[PDB]
Design an enzyme around this catalytic site. Structure first.
Site, mmCIF file in Angstrom:
data_model
loop_
_atom_site.group_PDB
_atom_site.id
_atom_site.type_symbol
_atom_site.label_atom_id
_atom_site.label_comp_id
_atom_site.label_asym_id
_atom_site.label_seq_id
_atom_site.Cartn_x
_atom_site.Cartn_y
_atom_site.Cartn_z
ATOM 1 N N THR A 107 4.981 9.801 -4.388
ATOM 2 C CA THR A 107 4.731 9.826 -5.648
ATOM 3 C C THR A 107 6.100 10.262 -6.681
ATOM 4 O OG1 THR A 107 2.503 10.548 -5.465
ATOM 5 C CG2 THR A 107 3.409 11.294 -7.675
HETATM 6 C C1 LIG Z 1 3.562 9.544 -3.304
HETATM 7 C C2 LIG Z 1 3.175 8.171 -3.323
HETATM 8 C C3 LIG Z 1 4.029 9.978 -1.837
HETATM 9 O O1 LIG Z 1 3.613 11.541 -1.921
HETATM 10 C C4 LIG Z 1 2.503 10.679 -4.003
HETATM 11 O O2 LIG Z 1 2.614 12.011 -3.837
HETATM 12 C C5 LIG Z 1 1.027 10.208 -3.546
HETATM 13 C C6 LIG Z 1 0.150 11.106 -4.549
HETATM 14 C C7 LIG Z 1 -0.845 10.269 -5.288
HETATM 15 C C8 LIG Z 1 -1.480 9.040 -4.762
HETATM 16 C C9 LIG Z 1 -2.285 11.327 -5.667
HETATM 17 N N1 LIG Z 1 0.731 10.794 -2.268
HETATM 18 C C10 LIG Z 1 0.274 10.179 -1.453
HETATM 19 O O3 LIG Z 1 -0.131 8.767 -1.439
HETATM 20 C C11 LIG Z 1 -0.493 10.636 -0.136
HETATM 21 C C12 LIG Z 1 0.694 11.344 0.623
HETATM 22 C C13 LIG Z 1 0.164 12.168 1.857
HETATM 23 C C14 LIG Z 1 -0.319 11.652 2.863
HETATM 24 C C15 LIG Z 1 -0.767 12.481 3.548
HETATM 25 C C16 LIG Z 1 -1.031 13.934 3.232
HETATM 26 C C17 LIG Z 1 -0.472 14.371 2.288
HETATM 27 C C18 LIG Z 1 0.198 13.539 1.375
HETATM 28 N N2 LIG Z 1 -1.153 9.932 0.593
HETATM 29 C C19 LIG Z 1 -2.512 10.242 0.797
HETATM 30 O O4 LIG Z 1 -3.236 11.114 0.803
HETATM 31 C C20 LIG Z 1 -3.220 9.089 1.711
HETATM 32 C C21 LIG Z 1 -3.864 8.207 0.630
HETATM 33 C C22 LIG Z 1 -3.947 6.716 1.246
HETATM 34 C C23 LIG Z 1 -5.422 6.225 0.540
HETATM 35 C C24 LIG Z 1 -4.118 6.577 2.606
HETATM 36 N N3 LIG Z 1 -4.137 9.537 2.444
HETATM 37 C C25 LIG Z 1 -3.753 9.873 4.069
HETATM 38 O O5 LIG Z 1 -2.804 9.561 4.544
HETATM 39 C C26 LIG Z 1 -5.218 10.010 4.827
HETATM 40 C C27 LIG Z 1 -5.749 11.617 4.680
HETATM 41 C C28 LIG Z 1 -4.631 12.570 4.710
HETATM 42 C C29 LIG Z 1 -5.111 13.820 5.433
HETATM 43 C C30 LIG Z 1 -4.929 14.917 4.461
HETATM 44 C C31 LIG Z 1 -5.636 16.140 4.889
HETATM 45 C C32 LIG Z 1 -6.308 16.187 6.224
HETATM 46 C C33 LIG Z 1 -6.372 14.822 6.903
HETATM 47 C C34 LIG Z 1 -5.836 13.759 6.694
HETATM 48 N N4 LIG Z 1 -4.714 9.731 6.153
HETATM 49 C C35 LIG Z 1 -5.155 8.678 6.790
HETATM 50 O O6 LIG Z 1 -5.745 7.760 6.256
HETATM 51 C C36 LIG Z 1 -4.841 8.504 8.213
HETATM 52 N N5 LIG Z 1 -4.247 7.197 8.745
HETATM 53 C C37 LIG Z 1 -3.802 6.268 7.637
HETATM 54 C C38 LIG Z 1 -2.763 5.445 8.433
HETATM 55 O O7 LIG Z 1 -3.806 4.876 9.234
HETATM 56 C C39 LIG Z 1 -4.298 5.574 10.441
HETATM 57 C C40 LIG Z 1 -5.134 6.643 9.605
#
Ligand SMILES: *[C@@](C)(CO)[C@](*)(O)[C@H](CC(C)C)NC(=O)[C@H](Cc1ccccc1)NC(=O)[C@H](CC(C)C)NC(=O)[C@H](CCc1ccccc1)NC(=O)CN1CCOCC1
Ligand SMILES: *[C@@](C)(CO)[C@](*)(O)[C@H](CC(C)C)NC(=O)[C@H](Cc1ccccc1)NC(=O)[C@H](CC(C)C)NC(=O)[C@H](CCc1ccccc1)NC(=O)CN1CCOCC1
Ligand SMILES: *[C@@](C)(CO)[C@](*)(O)[C@H](CC(C)C)NC(=O)[C@H](Cc1ccccc1)NC(=O)[C@H](CC(C)C)NC(=O)[C@H](CCc1ccccc1)NC(=O)CN1CCOCC1
Ligand SMILES: [Cl-]
Ligand SMILES: [Mg+2]
Ligand SMILES: [Mg+2]
Lengths: 212, 125, 196, 222, 204, 233, 195, 222, 195
Positions: free
Chosen positions: A1
């Site tokens: 982000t």
């Molecule tokens: C920029 C783009 C980078 O940080 C921004 O900060 C954005 C924020 C906006 C979209 C609100 N952040 C993200 O995109 C964020 C980064 C992140 C990832 C993981 C933890 C904290 C921050 N991404 C996510 O939250 C993603 C969203 C998309 C739909 C995949 N979600 C995950 O990665 C999930 C859930 C994470 C999680 C959090 C807490 C407890 C458990 C899990 N994880 C997965 O889907 C697992 N994984 C994906 C890849 O395939 C195998 C399974």
């Protein structure tokens, strides 16, 4: 982000990108990172999507309950503090949030609060939040003046996200713009970086590092 | 825990314990409030069957809830302390969460809510 | 593994199961753990298959070069060469070996070489993971100067029980007889030894 | 030490049209290098013209579907048999997932159906309850193989109008149900070729105003 | 601290009717920070083309090494090295560093000048040869490239048509990877002419 | 958080035209020690269901007691306990599946892999699997532990898909099960020769066979194998 | 958070606190006021873990303000410092302790004397002529040991304080963006705007 | 990988599948796992792909020099000895798991070698991730005195078991027959039971779809 | 060590390097020159691990000076940069690698063109119009993407550089005590004394 918001002569500009990532996997290019809490309040989202999405929509429900009980729209200060006090209760549990609560009220005027998941709450004129915050700061700070016009302020916000979208690998997709006035927030469109980058390069003459 | 429902309805639709609590108010010393164009004044009676009193230390009839709100009362003196304490705590709690002192309407609504709760809770008068 | 070697009136007999494992999977159910290092000097292999094979191959090479210069080597000499390899490389080896051989002067002899690389001359010896379950049985039933038939029965019954209780042991019971007469190979199948 | 999570493989895919929506998924179920079942469905009709699939750790997947199906049942009981809209279902599912934020369901969830204007709708969720409406989404083991193909063929990404000097983009348009099923079948045969956890069979659930139809196709069993 | 994914990048190669194509992106970064948008990953030694992904210092080193070795080859042999032979040389050189390897994913492409047959090959970091009739992929978005190629590819494509297929494979794969992109180059290779084209792509 | 102590190995099963077959050996292993030999790991429930269990034996015995108690509880205030309201194989399974997933969610699992085989009231064959993680699946053939790796390939040659079930008789099906058990004795280091087998047919009902042995084994070729490479003696 | 200093002179107590708030590689703010007025003649500055600091400071502020209203009387600096110490002493054996270090500067109106208390996150209290928390003390204590006298004026104390800030700006690794200075005396609390 | 070896009347036969993996991704769909050490000595290899190819080529090179030095046809036991001593020296770090077979003046032979340097003898053997699926078939259908045609059938059946049941194995079956007195016949793609079905759609793009910034002729000549 | 920047303009290359040397909680020096002249028209700045930086820089300096004497000829900036890269590429697989990042600014007299090369401790080389090492790049790259033009003068390049330093002084956590600026052009190497 990458997300930012700054205060100026004509109110508040708010600008965000639209990328979501899971490691190096680009999961989405079309994510909404601004939340419309009411006609006068906005919230920005950085960090965990679920965390940000869930709790900021919760925040909106708490703000609606305030105006039902008190017959008056909630202050930006009180709204930001509800969220900061909530995340403080969860401190250590692993919540991941970098948010900005932006809005206008009569008693406060245009106001911005930074709130994050380790409990930090700060009033301020300029903030950039996210993995590409430093890239946005570089352009925003070097071009910022209080006396910017509405037209120029909108562009600087847009241009700062574009800068971060280009250099930060975990930022991109499109730019979403918002302008907050005494009358409320106004949406200023979705801008795809696919077209916007080249348009800005040609018209502005910048981005000479890239093969034209 | 003591559970008895003390405040209940009667055949004619009255809650006698609430109405008898009003009689205790009628027994209390007189208290008056008048508001002008730019001020409010609170007056209070003190009975004169008590000489040899020490007025320095004797609890005053008017109490500050915050620096901008006051509370006077009529009725049982001991009961009033409990309401005043709860009000003072809520005043500081409001400043903490809302970052603004209470309105007079809000403070009143809180005190009134406490009084109501004691009319349909078990084991209390 | 379950392995043993027993001396008797006419010479010495070696015995072994035929199971090789990777965890709980049997990688080979018909393994030959009794291996020749010289005409009438053999060994029982336990522990790592790769280590024991590499050791046995080096010993066989040494004794072949001994024979070319100094004639037939003693069973003690063979054991010493095994010891030298096991002791000096103790940090990199997982090998439990029993050495057995027949001389005409010394008759039947048995040397056991545990993990550390120490040497122990004994009337009979047992080793491997399955040996733990037959210490009681073997001690109570072993006699000196047994006949060929008596010694075959003693090993058959002993390894039968070791196989019955140890999951890392099983398959067929292989044996090798070492006497003046020559070298005899024996085999015994599950249908026989299980119902003993 | 006991590990409460496992990986059951497989992959799922959702596409939305003008007046319809499809949700496809393979029928293979695996642990490590073994096949558990060649036909074990993981795309379900949940009622109210809502189809759902929760791919990843099957035990968490089944539990979530089971809980959402039950959520639909009680929605009827509590609100006078009112139809649960796809946007309302999506929000409800976020709360189901986020309720276990500190001991998550290890799944990628996708739901499909029609919105309140009759137009096709697809929503997708992460393990802890984030969600977003999209025209297109692939989930599971082969998501990284299929998704970029969908960007190119459904949303016409990186495709320009011939002769226009890369200035005019290929215009967006809705695809017919025939064209969509072609893309689904090709996506899964490609995924089967290059991913070991994908194969055996393909089950597609199509959702129109008339109801929920099924189609089945064989996939390579190696 | 995973050597193969610090800098980022991708390479893909394809065959057609009497031709071959090889393409790559232009990004070089340090984890999240994009540094350079001019870092080409394809090189050539005579008519034999080599693409290399992975750790950028090793990409540079190996290019300099194979230029070194192919220059000596030509002086002694008095002819240009062929793709089949060059593939064996890459494999030998990588396996020489079996227990201290170059963190790379190389790809060979070219047409044999004697037989005229189109040829492509891929390797892992320690030298295993992966030969293919159709296509070879490499880099941080290899999963994405595998999916694009397996669906888009068809045999016996003409040079002009093959260009479209390989370009769309690379572009759409790169846009789903954070560490790949920032420009792209495609090489179309016929028996005795080679065309090089730079692609327009999104710059985020 | 547990570790298993006394353990049972593979359970194997398949469907045939009129019903289902299931089998498991009679061994209770204590690590590498083959400790207990008289252990029954197939447990019938009524005259229409058999539950086969592998893994920790103490947890198996706990599950036995739960099933025994389920029968008792189903009979309470139920005139049709031996008729229309009898315990179905699908009821028994869903209960066990619920328990297994609840226990894993409390981080205190029953350390087992379970196969419920039986015939429903409408004649339909029932065969489904559940384990310590709460994972469930169904297939024409099912097996746990080593059986999954060695038995399933053999049993799938007989019944490869759904349409092969009507074409498979009870004679052919039992033959394939018995063979699979022999193969497991050859190759699994925590298996025994003695085993139990159970058939549930829609016509002839429940048949429970005890004290079966693996026989017709090939060992004679072992005599010809000498050394490990170059040895000729 | 980082730098907080305190000096007690003849007739007043002076607190100086850094303005920077830094997270990661970014200075998010350069005008942060790291202090709260507990009562008209008592001031508390604070530094430590993010979130904890402000949460703790405001919690103490609320409790002292509650006391003032209830009794219609101002607690002495000694009494306030003891209350704060006990709260931190409770905290250190909690499930999640407050990681906050504080300085309390006050003017006792009954004694007509200024007072400065230093309290760390463990609940370690000391009364001092001059005090500091964190790495600041490693420079300022030795400096003040040399230049400090007990009979100094408020103006002399401010010059003495300028000498500390100059040294920190010369030898400290991080940019703390200057300090906000506040004085506590018989007339209450006021802020110096030009420092 | 799945690999097997089976002895018969007048020789020995070996076989292998043709899948090469990279985690859960199929890297090569038709790779050759049968290696020629000498004309009548062949090798099936599982494990680390680069190691099996490198170790087989090194020993094959040294065997050729040995054959020329001695004026004799090479023996299987020589290849066995050289492979085991090389692998032992590297203490398992060279991840090669081999089935070695062939004919020579001594007769026909069948051996297996593991990465740490241990060897085994047998009439039937199987190695790799699908060795359990293959060994189940071999233990079921193997008998003494097999003919040539019977042994090929048994070997390929054992590989098929791995192809269908093991996720590590797939695609085609390669065979090599080594009979006494005859030339060894290498049967590349002996069975091909995994042909890709026709695609639903052609993805041939209209010419001009891709946006271009620059063109230039490249100089390959001197 | 910490901040090193580089900008290539029309007719020159400009290098800016921070003056601070910090160990622990003490700034030991505020006038440190983090650069070495390799040849009359080639300059190298450096940053990284203590000790390694100067040891590496001087080792390269000695080798290039040796070449100059031997051939009576100045190596091109491209040739020098390739030599440096190879030395770092060797180093990374040594028992103890050099942990040093460098920028090489030079003027090629044969081509009459300025050249700027960025090389990290792994031996990763790139030619760039502007470059930076460490955390500096996270601010300066986006800034230069906006304000940089290829046809700028040396004076314009210095103003562009002032804009970078100002931003770093505003948003960086640590005090790096300003920068030493040096220009490389057709007439050689010179230092700007007032920055
Ligand atoms: C920029 C783009 C980078 O940080 C921004 O900060 C954005 C924020 C906006 C979209 C609100 N952040 C993200 O995109 C964020 C980064 C992140 C990832 C993981 C933890 C904290 C921050 N991404 C996510 O939250 C993603 C969203 C998309 C739909 C995949 N979600 C995950 O990665 C999930 C859930 C994470 C999680 C959090 C807490 C407890 C458990 C899990 N994880 C997965 O889907 C697992 N994984 C994906 C890849 O395939 C195998 C399974
Ligand atoms: C009985 C079984 C126990 O005393 C006997 O001693 C026999 C001896 C006979 C064969 C001469 N021992 C074995 O069968 C032996 C047991 C063993 C296992 C591990 C270490 C020491 C002893 N088995 C083996 O040596 C097998 C033979 C192969 C399968 C043909 N080798 C392995 O299991 C190798 C051993 C590697 C090794 C480890 C430590 C020291 C030396 C060598 N291990 C693996 O392949 C690892 N494998 C990977 C997949 O997960 C399961 C483990
Ligand atoms: C079946 C498939 C498995 O039982 C067979 O055994 C086959 C054997 C045939 C192909 C000879 N085995 C494989 O396909 C084998 C699986 C494997 C993977 C990892 C370790 C051991 C075995 N695959 C490979 O060896 C591939 C061959 C490629 C696809 C051509 N190689 C890799 O996956 C390499 C492994 C490199 C390695 C180095 C050091 C020690 C062990 C292995 N890994 C990568 O390429 C991954 N990565 C890509 C990004 O760059 C860094 C490396
Ligand atoms: Cl062995
Ligand atoms: Mg398979
Ligand atoms: Mg970007």
């Amino acid at each position: 982000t990458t997300t930012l918001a700054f205060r100026f002569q004509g109110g508040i500009i708010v600008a965000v990108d639209s990328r979501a990532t899971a490691g190096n996997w680009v999961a989405s290019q079309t994510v909404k990172k601004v939340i419309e809490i009411n006609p006068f309040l906005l919230g920005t989202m950085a960090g965990g999507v679920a965390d940000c999405q869930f709790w900021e929509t919760w925040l909106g429900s708490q703000c609606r309950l305030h105006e039902l009980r008190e017959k008056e729209r909630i202050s930006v200060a009180a709204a930001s503090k509800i969220l900061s006090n909530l995340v403080y209760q969860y401190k250590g549990a692993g919540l991941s949030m970098g948010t900005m609560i932006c809005g206008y009220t009569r008693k406060e005027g245009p106001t911005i609060y930074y709130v994050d998941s380790d409990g930090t709450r700060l009033k301020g004129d300029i903030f950039c939040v996210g993995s590409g915050q430093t890239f946005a700061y570089g352009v925003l700070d070097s071009n910022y003046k209080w006396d910017l016009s509405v037209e120029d302020a909108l562009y600087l916000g847009k241009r700062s996200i574009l800068a971060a979208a280009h250099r930060d690998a975990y930022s991109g997709g499109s730019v979403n713009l918002y302008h907050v006035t005494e009358d409320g927030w106004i949406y200023h469109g979705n801008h795809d970086v696919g077209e916007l980058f080249w348009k800005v390069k040609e018209e502005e003459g910048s981005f000479n590092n890239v093969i034209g | 825990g003591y559970d008895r429902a003390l405040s209940i309805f009667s055949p004619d639709g009255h809650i006698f314990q609430v109405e008898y609590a009003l009689e205790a108010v009628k027994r209390g010393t007189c208290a008056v409030g008048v508001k002008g164009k730019n001020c409010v004044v609170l007056g209070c009676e003190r009975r004169s069957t008590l000489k040899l009193q020490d007025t320095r230390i004797t609890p005053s009839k008017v109490s500050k809830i915050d620096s901008h709100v006051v509370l006077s009362f009529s009725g049982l003196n001991a009961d009033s302390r409990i309401l005043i304490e709860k009000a003072r705590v809520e005043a500081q709690s409001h400043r903490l969460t809302l970052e603004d002192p209470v309105t007079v309407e809000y403070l009143t609504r809180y005190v009134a809510g406490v009084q109501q709760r004691y009319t349909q809770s078990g084991g209390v008068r | 593994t379950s392995i043993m070697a027993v001396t008797f009136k006419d010479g010495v007999i070696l015995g072994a199961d035929s199971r090789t494992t990777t965890g709980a999977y049997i990688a080979n159910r018909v393994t030959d753990k009794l291996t020749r290092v010289h005409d009438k000097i053999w060994c029982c292999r336990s522990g790592s298959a790769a280590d024991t094979q590499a050791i046995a191959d080096i010993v066989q090479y040494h004794l072949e070069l001994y024979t070319s210069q100094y004639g037939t080597p003693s069973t003690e000499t063979a054991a010493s060469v095994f010891k030298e390899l096991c002791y000096e490389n103790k940090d990199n080896l997982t090998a439990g070996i029993i050495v057995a051989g027949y001389d005409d002067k010394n008759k039947g002899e048995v040397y056991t070489i545990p993990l550390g690389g120490s040497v122990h001359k004994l009337p009979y010896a047992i080793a491997g993971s399955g040996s733990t379950f037959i210490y009681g049985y073997c001690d109570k039933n072993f006699r000196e100067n047994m006949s060929k038939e008596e010694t075959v029965d003693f090993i058959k019954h002993s390894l039968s029980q070791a196989i019955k209780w140890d999951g890392s042991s099983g398959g067929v019971i292989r044996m090798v007889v070492l006497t003046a007469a020559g070298v005899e190979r024996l085999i015994f199948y599950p249908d026989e030894y299980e119902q003993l | 030490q006991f590990n409460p999570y496992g990986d059951n493989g497989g992959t799922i895919l959702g596409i939305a049209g003008e007046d319809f929506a499809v949700l496809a998924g393979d029928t293979r179920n695996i642990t490590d290098y073994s096949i558990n079942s060649r036909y074990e469905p993981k795309v379900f009709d949940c009622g109210d013209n809502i189809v759902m699939s929760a791919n990843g750790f099957a035990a968490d997947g089944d539990a979530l579907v089971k809980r959402f199906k039950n959520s639909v049942k009680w929605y009827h009981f509590d609100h006078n048999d009112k139809k649960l809209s796809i946007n309302s279902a999506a929000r409800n599912i976020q709360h189901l997932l986020y309720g276990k934020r500190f001991f998550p369901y290890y799944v990628h969830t996708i739901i499909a159906g029609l919105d309140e204007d009759g137009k096709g709708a697809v929503y997708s969720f992460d393990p802890v309850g984030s969600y977003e409406r999209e025209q297109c989404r692939a989930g599971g083991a082969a998501a990284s193989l299929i998704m970029p193909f969908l960007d190119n063929q459904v949303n016409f990404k990186n495709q320009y109008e011939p002769g226009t000097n890369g200035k005019v983009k290929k215009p967006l348009k809705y695809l017919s149900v025939e064209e969509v099923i072609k893309l689904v079948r090709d996506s899964f045969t490609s995924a089967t070729e290059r991913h070991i956890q994908v194969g055996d069979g393909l089950e597609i659930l199509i959702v129109t105003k008339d109801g929920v139809r099924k189609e089945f196709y064989e996939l390579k069993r190696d | 601290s995973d050597p193969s994914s610090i800098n980022g990048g991708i390479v893909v190669a394809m065959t057609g009717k009497d031709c071959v194509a090889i393409a790559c992106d232009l990004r070089l970064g340090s984890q999240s920070l994009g540094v350079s948008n001019k870092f080409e990953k394809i090189f050539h030694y005579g008519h034999v083309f080599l693409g290399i992904t992975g750790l950028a210092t090793d990409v540079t080193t190996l290019n300099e090494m194979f230029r070194y070795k192919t220059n000596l080859y030509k002086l002694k042999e008095e002819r240009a090295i062929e793709p089949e032979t060059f593939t064996q040389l890459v494999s030998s050189s990588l396996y020489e560093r079996r227990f201290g390897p170059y963190f790379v994913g190389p790809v060979v492409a070219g047409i044999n000048s004697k037989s005229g047959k189109p040829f492509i090959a891929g390797f892992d970091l320690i030298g295993c040869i992966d030969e293919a009739k159709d296509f070879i992929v490499s880099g941080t978005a290899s999963d994405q490239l595998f999916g694009m190629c397996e669906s888009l590819y068809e045999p016996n494509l003409e040079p002009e048509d093959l260009f479209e297929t390989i370009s769309q494979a690379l572009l759409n794969a790169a846009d789903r990877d954070a560490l790949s992109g920032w420009g792209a180059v495609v090489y179309i290779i016929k028996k005795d002419e080679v065309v090089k084209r730079y692609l327009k792509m999104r710059q985020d | 958080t547990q570790q298993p102590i006394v353990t049972g190995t593979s359970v194997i099963s398949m469907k045939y035209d009129n019903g289902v077959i299931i089998a498991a050996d009679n061994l209770g292993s204590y690590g590498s020690l083959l400790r207990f030999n008289g252990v029954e790991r197939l447990i019938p429930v009524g005259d229409n269901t058999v539950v086969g269990i592998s893994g920790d034996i103490s947890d198996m015995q706990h599950i036995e007691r739960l099933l025994k108690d389920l029968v008792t509880e189903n009979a309470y205030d139920n005139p049709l306990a031996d008729a229309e309201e009898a315990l179905e194989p699908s009821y028994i399974f869903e209960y066990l599946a619920t328990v297994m997933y609840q226990r894993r969610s409390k981080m205190n699992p029953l350390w087992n892999a379970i196969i419920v085989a039986g015939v429903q009231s409408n004649g339909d064959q029932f065969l489904r699997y559940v384990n310590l993680l709460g994972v469930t699946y169904s297939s024409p053939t099912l097996a746990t532990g080593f059986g999954a790796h060695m038995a399933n390939p053999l049993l799938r040659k007989v019944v490869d898909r759904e349409s092969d079930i009507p074409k498979t008789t009870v004679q052919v099906a039992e033959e394939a099960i018995v063979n699979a058990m022999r193969v497991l004795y050859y190759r699994d280091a925590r298996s025994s020769r003695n085993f139990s087998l159970a058939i549930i047919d829609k016509n002839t009902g429940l048949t429970f066979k005890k004290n079966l042995q693996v026989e017709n084994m090939k060992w004679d070729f072992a005599k010809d194998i000498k050394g490990y490479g170059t040895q000729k003696i | 958070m980082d730098i907080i200093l305190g000096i007690r002179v003849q007739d007043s107590v002076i607190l100086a606190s850094s303005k920077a708030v830094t997270r990661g590689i970014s200075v998010l703010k350069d005008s942060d006021d790291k202090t709260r007025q507990l009562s008209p003649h008592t001031l508390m500055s604070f530094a430590g873990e993010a979130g904890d600091t402000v949460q703790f400071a405001e919690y103490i502020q609320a409790n002292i303000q509650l006391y003032s209203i209830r009794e219609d009387y101002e607690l002495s600096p000694q009494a306030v410092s003891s209350f704060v110490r006990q709260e931190l002493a409770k905290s250190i054996r909690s499930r999640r302790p407050y990681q906050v270090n504080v300085l309390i500067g006050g003017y006792d109106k009954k004694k007509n004397k200024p007072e400065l208390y230093q309290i760390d996150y463990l609940g370690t209290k000391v009364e001092l002529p001059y005090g500091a928390h964190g790495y600041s003390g490693f420079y300022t204590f030795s400096l003040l040991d040399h230049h400090y006298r007990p009979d100094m004026t408020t103006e002399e104390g401010l010059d003495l304080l300028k000498l500390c800030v100059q040294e920190l700006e010369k030898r400290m690794p991080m940019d703390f963006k200057g300090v906000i200075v506040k004085i506590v005396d018989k007339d209450g609390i006021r802020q110096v705007d030009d420092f | 990988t799945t690999i097997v070896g089976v002895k018969f009347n007048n020789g020995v036969v070996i076989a292998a599948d043709t899948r090469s993996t990279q985690g859960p991704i199929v890297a090569d769909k038709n790779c050759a796992k049968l290696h020629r050490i000498s004309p009548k000595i062949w090798c099936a290899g599982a494990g680390t792909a680069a190691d099996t190819e490198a170790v087989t080529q090194l020993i094959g090179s040294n065997i050729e020099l040995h054959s020329l030095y001695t004026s004799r046809e090479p023996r299987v036991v020589s290849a066995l000895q050289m492979l085991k001593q090389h692998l032992f020296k590297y203490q398992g770090h060279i991840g090669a798991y081999l089935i070695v077979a062939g004919v020579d003046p001594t007769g026909s032979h069948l051996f297996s070698i593991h990465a740490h340097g241990s060897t085994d003898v047998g009439y039937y053997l199987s190695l790799g991730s699908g060795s359990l699926a293959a060994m189940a078939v071999l233990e079921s259908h193997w008998k003494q005195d097999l003919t040539k045609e019977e042994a090929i059938k048994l070997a390929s059946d054992a590989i098929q078991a791995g192809i269908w049941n093991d996720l590590g194995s797939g695609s085609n079956v390669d065979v090599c027959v080594m009979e006494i007195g005859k030339d060894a016949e290498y049967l590349r793609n002996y069975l091909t039971p995994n042909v890709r079905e026709e695609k639903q759609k052609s993805y041939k793009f209209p010419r001009g779809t891709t946006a271009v910034l620059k063109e230039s002729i490249v100089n390959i000549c001197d």
